[PDB]
């Protein structure tokens, strides 16, 4: 029921509103995980709730700020299409202003695992890494103290799995070599380079000479590689579990949720499997390689795209022009190479859409120009060129029932933004004023006497 | 409630009935409503069937149709009731006129109720009536 679904939506909004912003960001993770298909109105409602949560996590709440940067990039990308989408886009300007106040049926995606081979420089390396992995696994078993005997029984602490590297046959190793090798074949698949550098380094059963594999840690992008391979391990294990439970004819198991709504132990086991290679590489000296400010950085890119769209926007992308006005007002709420580029792009868009001055853009151009004029001091001698551009704009808005007062107030905003802290445009505005004096008039007269300073 | 609306609803229900003992099918609810000009969504049709067995009975059908009719009728009546006053066209009610017209026939109890309105109305005194609607209707 749409009423019952809306009741559940209001219940979730009330649960997410007054609850600190840590779990709110944990839910905003999955909200951004599902929000990218906004281009389905319930995703837009969840995005409005996440925008309200960003409005609740702006100063103290706004690590995950890099996830917030990727989420703002996804909100720029999915909402780059040009209703209820107008409501979610009105939430999206609050989302961008709060991100600047920060800057003040899921189905896993498997990759092929045994189709890209192994270099021999690691084939003279796995032949001792398997012995060292048996060292660490035998230390983990001797933490309990499994003593090997003739009767394999788990009452008097006896396993048949505590045996050294020499007693193992050609298939007993391959049981525990199999997931490690078929994860090495995944790590060697995407184009990763582990090349030559320097070298380096009770109870009964198998007492190893094991290096302590518990306190070795890599750097940021190296653990980004390890986290991507942990997600690969989890997606292969989720494919295994979801093709393990779809072999009967019933339902499922309720842990089949998005990847940013799970626990850590199942990911910690995959983390140890991914990183026991990496710790051993950093111990032996083998290195691992590949083989905010981004909002204001892409604000010149977004401004150039908005000007290139507003050059020929005479068709349904004028909602994009209102979104660009809202993004500029949000940057005004969150404010000079990119800033001067944005002011020049505001002048270029005020000149590029001056000849056709859609429908909401005809009222939103005044708001956009006023917001840019107020934000011009919150952020350079060639302004006579955009001044003559706005002179031709007001000449195109004079004879083309309150547009002359709108041009007079736009000239007031321009002269006030230039005076917030070459005389061709003064001659052009005086020419239009003396031309349209005998035949929006009194407002122009009091606007020229207010923009005189 | 008006008479020929009841006549039309009865005639449509019996028209898409065959045996005549208040027993039509569940899926013919959409057919009989679209014969009556009513077309909600599928889940709302299902919620109204679940509000009702397999055989849709007569009076509760009239009651649900009365809800759907008196919704729009209540909007037009709250329109026309304050088009009695306030001839300009802004829906804005002065509080002295609220003291006047709140003691109207029907209830017309004591100063408790008009103080109860005046303590919370928002008064700029011209008051928008939709705040009054949201106040009274919980």
Q: What's the 3-state SS for chain A?
A: CHHHHHHHHHHHHHHHHCCCCHHHHHHHHHHHHHHHHCCCHHHHHHHHHHHHHHHHCCCCCCCCHHHHHHHHHHHHHHCCCCCHHHHHHHHHHHHHHHHHHCCCCCCCCCCCCCCCCCCHHHHCCHHHHHHHHHHHHHHHHHCCCCCCCCCCCCCCCCCCCCCCCCCCCCCHHHHHHHHHHHHHHHHCCCCCCCCCCCCCCCCCCCCCCCCCCCCCCCCHHHHHHHHHHHHHHHHHHHHHHHCCCCCCCCCCCCCCCCCCCCCCHHHHHHHHHHHHHHHHHHHHCCCCCCCCCHHHHHHHHHHHHHHHHHCCCCCCCHHHHHHHHHHHHHHHHCCCHHHHHHHHHHHHHHHHCCCCCCCHHHHHHHHHHHHHHHHCCCCCCCCHHHHHHHHHHHHHHHCCCCHHHHHHHHHHHHHHHHCCCCCHHHHHHHHHHHHCCCCCCHHHHHHHCCCCC
Q: With contact defined as beta carbons under 8 Å apart, do A17 and A56 qualify?
A: yes
* Rg of chain B (C-alpha set): 21
- A-interface mutation test, from B42, B46, B47, B49, most A Cβ less than 10 A away: B47
Query: Rounded to an integer, what distance in angstroms lies between the CA atom of residue B138 and that of residue B135?
Result: 6
Residues of B in contact with A6 (CB under 8 A): none
Could you tell me if B49 lies within 8 Å of chain A, comparing CB atoms?
Answer: no
Count A/B contacts: CB-CB distance under 8 Å: 10
In A, minimum Cα distance to B45 occurs at: A1
Helix count (H) and strand count (E) of chain B? Answer: 7, 2
- Shortest CA gap A3–chain B (Å): 8
In B, minimum Cα distance to A3 occurs at: B44
Query: Rounded to an integer, what distance in angstroms lies between the CA atom of residue A271 and that of residue A227?
Result: 7
CB contact under 8 A, A3 and B41: no
DSSP H or E stretch at residue B93: strand B92-93
Query: Rounded to an integer, what distance in angstroms lies between the CA atom of residue A35 and that of residue A22?
Result: 19
CB contact under 8 A, A2 and B43: yes
| Strand, coil or helix: B127 | strand
Query: Rounded to an integer, what distance in angstroms lies between the CA atom of residue A50 and that of residue B111?
Result: 46
Pick from A90, A88, A89: which is nearest to A42 by CA?
A88
Could you tell me if B41 lies within 8 Å of chain A, comparing CB atoms?
Answer: yes
CB contact under 8 A, B41 and A2: yes
Q: Which stretches of chain A sit within 8 Å of chain B by CB?
A: 1-4
Contacts of A181 (CB under 8 A, 6+ apart): A126
Technique that determined the structure: cryo-EM
Contacts of B52 (CB under 8 A, 6+ apart): B60, B61
CB neighbour class for B136 (10 Å; exposed up to 12, middle 13-18, buried from 19): exposed
What are B13's two structure tokens?
Answer: 């229900």
| Strand, coil or helix: B92 | strand
CB contact under 8 A, A2 and B46: no
Query: Rounded to an integer, what distance in angstroms lies between the CA atom of residue A83 and that of residue A88?
Result: 9
Q: With contact defined as beta carbons under 8 Å apart, do A179 and A269 qualify?
A: no
In A, minimum Cα distance to B49 occurs at: A1
- Shortest CA gap A41–chain B (Å): 16
- Shortest CA gap B117–chain A (Å): 29
Q: What is the Cα A168 distance to its own chain's centre?
A: 48
Residues of B in contact with A4 (CB under 8 A): 47
Residues of A in contact with B68 (CB under 8 A): none
Q: How many CB atoms lie within 10 A of CB A233?
A: 20
Pick from A391, A377, A297: which is nearest to A343 by CA?
A377
C-alpha distances out from residue B52 to A352, B35, B69, Å: 61, 20, 18
DSSP H or E stretch at residue B34: helix B28-35
Pick from A219, A328, A322, A229: which is nearest to A271 by CA?
A229
Could you tell me if B44 lies within 8 Å of chain A, comparing CB atoms?
Answer: yes
Residues of B in contact with A1 (CB under 8 A): 43-44, 46-47
b/e for A413-448, b at 16 or more Cβ within 10 A? bbbbbeeeeeeebeebbeebbeeeeeebeebbeebb
Q: Give long-range contacts, CB 8 A cutoff, 24+ apart: A218-227.
A: A218/A275, A218/A278, A218/A282, A218/A288, A221/A290, A222/A278, A222/A288, A222/A289, A225/A192, A225/A288, A225/A290, A226/A271, A226/A274, A226/A275, A226/A278
- Shortest CA gap B51–chain A (Å): 12
- Shortest CA gap A7–chain B (Å): 14
- Residue given tokens 């190296």 in the structure block: A222
CB contact under 8 A, A3 and B46: no
The crossing angle, in degrees rounded to 10, of helices B111-118 and B95-102 is 150
Pick from A401, A413, A328, A320: which is nearest to A370 by CA?
A413
Query: Rounded to an integer, what distance in angstroms lies between the CA atom of residue A295 and that of residue A342?
Result: 13
CB neighbour class for B71 (10 Å; exposed up to 12, middle 13-18, buried from 19): exposed
Residues of B in contact with A3 (CB under 8 A): 44, 47
Query: Rounded to an integer, what distance in angstroms lies between the CA atom of residue A33 and that of residue A22?
Result: 17
Contacts of A37 (CB under 8 A, 6+ apart): A43, A78
- Shortest CA gap A35–chain B (Å): 25
CB contact under 8 A, B44 and A4: no
Query: Rounded to an integer, what distance in angstroms lies between the CA atom of residue A108 and that of residue A237?
Result: 10
- Shortest CA gap A1–chain B (Å): 5
Could you tell me if B51 lies within 8 Å of chain A, comparing CB atoms?
Answer: no
Q: How many CB atoms lie within 10 A of CB B97?
A: 14
Could you tell me if B47 lies within 8 Å of chain A, comparing CB atoms?
Answer: yes
Query: Rounded to an integer, what distance in angstroms lies between the CA atom of residue A74 and that of residue A298?
Result: 13
Question: Which runs of E-coded beta strand occur in B11-63?
Answer: none
Could you tell me if B94 lies within 8 Å of chain A, comparing CB atoms?
Answer: no
Could you tell me if B71 lies within 8 Å of chain A, comparing CB atoms?
Answer: no
- Shortest CA gap B47–chain A (Å): 6
C-alpha distances out from residue A89 to A41, A92, B13, B103, Å: 12, 5, 46, 46
Cited resolution, angstroms = 4.2
CB neighbour class for A118 (10 Å; exposed up to 12, middle 13-18, buried from 19): middle
Q: What are the backbone angles phi and psi of residue A255, rounded to the nearest 5°?
A: -90, 10
Query: Rounded to an integer, what distance in angstroms lies between the CA atom of residue A146 and that of residue A154?
Result: 9
């Amino acid at each position: 029921k749409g009423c019952s679904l809306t009741k559940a939506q209001r219940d979730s909004i009330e649960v997410c509103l007054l609850s600190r912003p840590s779990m709110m960001q944990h839910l905003l993770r999955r909200l951004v995980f599902d929000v990218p298909l906004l281009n389905k109105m319930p995703l837009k409602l969840l995005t409005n709730h996440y925008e309200r949560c960003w409005k609740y996590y702006c100063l103290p709440g706004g690590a995950s700020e890099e996830e917030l940067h990727l989420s703002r990039k996804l909100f720029w990308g999915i909402f780059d299409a040009l209703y209820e989408q107008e409501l979610f886009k009105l939430a999206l300007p609050c989302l961008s202003a709060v991100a600047g106040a920060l800057p003040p049926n899921f189905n896993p995606q498997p990759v092929d695992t045994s189709n890209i081979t192994i270099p021999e420089k690691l084939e003279y390396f796995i032949n001792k890494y398997a012995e060292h992995s048996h060292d660490k696994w035998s230390m983990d078993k001797l933490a309990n103290g499994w003593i090997y005997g003739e009767i394999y029984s788990d009452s008097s602490k006896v396993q048949p799995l505590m045996k050294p590297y020499k007693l193992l046959s050609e298939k007993e190793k391959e049981i525990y070599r199999w997931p490690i090798k078929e994860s090495l074949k995944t790590m060697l698949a995407w184009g990763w380079r582990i090349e030559r550098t320097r070298e380096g380094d009770a109870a009964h059963g198998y007492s190893p000479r094991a290096i302590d594999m518990s306190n070795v840690t890599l750097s940021r992008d190296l653990h980004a590689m390890a986290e991507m391979m942990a997600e690969n391990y989890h997606n292969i294990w989720a494919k295994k579990k979801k093709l393990e439970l779809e072999s009967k004819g019933g339902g499922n198991h309720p842990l089949l949720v998005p990847y940013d709504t799970l626990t850590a132990k199942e990911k910690a086991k995959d983390r140890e499997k991914a990183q026991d290679i990496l710790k051993f590489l950093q111990i032996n000296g083998y290195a691992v390689s590949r083989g905010y400010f981004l909002s204001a950085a892409s604000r010149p890119l977004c401004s150039g795209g908005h000007a290139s769209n507003k050059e020929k926007e005479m068709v349904f992308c004028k909602l994009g022009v209102l979104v660009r006005h809202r993004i500029s007002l949000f940057g005004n709420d969150a404010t000079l190479h990119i800033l001067g580029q944005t002011l020049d792009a505001r002048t270029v868009m005020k000149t590029g859409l001056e000849s056709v001055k859609f429908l909401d853009n005809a009222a939103e151009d005044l708001e956009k120009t006023m917001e840019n004029l107020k934000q011009g001091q919150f952020t350079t001698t060639v302004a006579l060129l955009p001044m003559l551009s706005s002179l031709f704009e007001h000449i195109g808005q004079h004879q083309f029932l309150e547009d002359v007062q709108v041009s007079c107030y736009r000239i007031l905003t321009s002269l006030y933004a230039l005076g917030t802290s070459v005389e061709r445009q003064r001659s052009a505005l005086g020419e239009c004023l003396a031309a349209f004096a005998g035949a929006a008039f009194l407002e122009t007269h009091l606007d020229k006497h207010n923009i005189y300073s | 409630l008006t008479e020929e609306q009841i006549a039309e609803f009865k005639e449509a229900f019996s028209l898409f009935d065959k045996d005549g003992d208040g027993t039509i099918t569940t899926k013919a609810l959409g057919t009989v409503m679209r014969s009556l000009g009513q077309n909600p969504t599928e889940a709302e049709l299902q919620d109204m069937i679940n509000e009702v067995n397999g055989t849709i009975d007569f009076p509760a059908f009239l009651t649900m149709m009365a809800r759907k009719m008196k919704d729009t009728d209540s909007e037009e009546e709250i329109r026309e009731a304050f088009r009695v006053f306030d001839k300009d066209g802004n829906g804005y009610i002065s509080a002295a006129a609220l003291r006047h017209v709140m003691t109207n026939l029907g209830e017309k109890l004591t100063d408790e109720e008009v103080d109860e309105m005046i303590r919370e109305a928002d008064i700029d005194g011209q008051v928008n009536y939709e705040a009054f609607v949201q106040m009274m209707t919980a």
